[PDB]
């Protein structure tokens, strides 16, 4: 969660303009599990 | 050519942001 905020800081400037986020992130994400 | 919609400024911010993120 802290990483969600920090990576928000490190990836918001990719778009530089604005950025609910939902799965609309400024990064391309998927999950891997058991 | 490029088809142009018409909306009444009801919910343009959220809708257009959703368009920008979806595709």
Residue listed under structure tokens 């303009």: A17
B21 CB contacts (<8 Å, ≥6 apart)? A24
SS3 of chain B? CCCCCCCCCCCHHHHHHHHHHHC
A-chain residue closest to B19, CA distance: A24
Tell me which chain B residues have a C-beta less than 8 angstroms from the C-beta of A27: none
Residue listed under structure tokens 């990719």: A14
Secondary structure element (H or E) that encloses residue A14, with its range:
helix A2-15
Question: What is the 8-class DSSP label of residue A28?
Answer: -
CA distances from A32 to A27, A29 (A): 16, 10
Q: Which of A2, A24, B14 is nearest to A12 (CA)?
A: A24
Yes or no: say if A14 and A26 are a contact pair by the CB < 8 Å rule.
yes
Q: What resolution, expressed in A, was reported for this entry?
A: 4.4
Tell me which chain A residues have a C-beta less than 8 angstroms from the C-beta of B18: 24
Yes or no: say if B21 and A24 are a contact pair by the CB < 8 Å rule.
yes
By what method was this entry solved?
Answer: cryo-EM
């Amino acid at each position: 969660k802290k990483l969600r905020e920090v990576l928000h800081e490190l990836y918001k400037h990719l778009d530089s303009s604005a950025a609910s986020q939902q799965e609309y992130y400024p990064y391309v994400y998927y999950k891997i599990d058991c | 050519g490029f088809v142009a919609g018409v909306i009444n400024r009801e919910r343009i911010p959220t809708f257009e942001r959703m368009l920008w993120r979806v595709c």
